[PDB]
């Protein structure tokens, strides 16, 4: 007999978690299943409950998580892997911005360490995210708003810097 459809695995309030802040991971499949199994891939340790409450985020809790449920003798396909990120592990980078060509805006996420990954975002609902393997990013048709940037290493991509101080982009003439 074949497996069941995958559950979802979600971090609330967010999967981007500052060190020392709370996060809850929740596995959710169909109503009435018999067992949920939630694991962390780095340790291959697991708990047989759908909910994991982390009162205060730690570096060692960052990384990929996955869950499956069982019903009868049958297992589900596993969830998409949740990528739990610890922020604030390293000093914050410095974010600057300049007009580019046309409506392009150049954002620079500058650091002292030798980082090779950078995530930039504009506050809002929804948030606009940009990610790059180099510290200069061109945002095409950039929107006005509040931007911040994180730096990290591709060798452990789940441990991020503190976010940069905000920069305010005013596109309106």
Ligand X SMILES: *[C@@H]1O[C@H](CO)[C@@H](O)[C@H](O)[C@H]1NC(C)=O
Helix (H) or strand (E) holding 75: strand 74-75
Site string for ligand X, 19-38 (x = CB under 6 A): -----------x-xx-----
Question: Which residue from 62, 57, 58 is spatially nearest to 41, judged by alpha carbons?
Answer: 62
User: Of ligand X, Cl ion, none, which one does residue 8 interact with (CB within 5 to 8 Å by kind)?
Assistant: Cl ion
Per-residue tokens: 126: 């929804």
By CB under 5 A, residue 70 contacts Cl ion: no
By CB under 5 A, residue 10 contacts Cl ion: yes
Q: At residue 73, what are phi and psi to the nearest 5 degrees?
A: -95, 0
* Cα–Cα dist 14/19, whole Å: 13
By CB under 6 A, residue 102 contacts ligand X: no
Binding site for ligand X (CB under 6 A): 4, 30, 32-33, 71-72
Q: Using CB under 5 A, list all residues that contact Cl ion.
A: 4, 8, 10, 16, 26, 28, 89, 100, 104, 106, 138
């Amino acid at each position: 007999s074949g497996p069941l459809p995958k559950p979802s695995l979600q971090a609330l309030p967010s999967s981007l978690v500052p060190l020392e802040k709370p996060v809850t991971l929740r596995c959710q499949g169909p109503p009435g299943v018999d067992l949920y199994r939630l694991e962390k891939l780095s340790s291959s340790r697991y708990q047989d409950q759908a909910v994991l409450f982390i009162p205060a985020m730690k570096r060692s809790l960052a990384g990929r998580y996955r869950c499956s449920y069982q019903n009868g003798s049958l297992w589900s396909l596993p969830s998409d892997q949740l990528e739990l990120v610890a922020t604030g592990v390293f000093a914050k980078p410095s974010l600057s911005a300049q007009p580019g060509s046309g409506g392009d805006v150049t954002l620079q996420c500058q650091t002292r360490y030798g980082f090779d990954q950078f995530a930039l975002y504009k506050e809002g609902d929804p948030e606009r995210w940009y990610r790059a393997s180099f510290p200069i990013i061109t945002v095409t048709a950039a929107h006005s708003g509040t931007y911040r940037c994180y730096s990290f290493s591709s060798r452990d991509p789940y441990l991020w810097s503190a976010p940069s101080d905000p920069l305010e982009l005013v596109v309106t003439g």
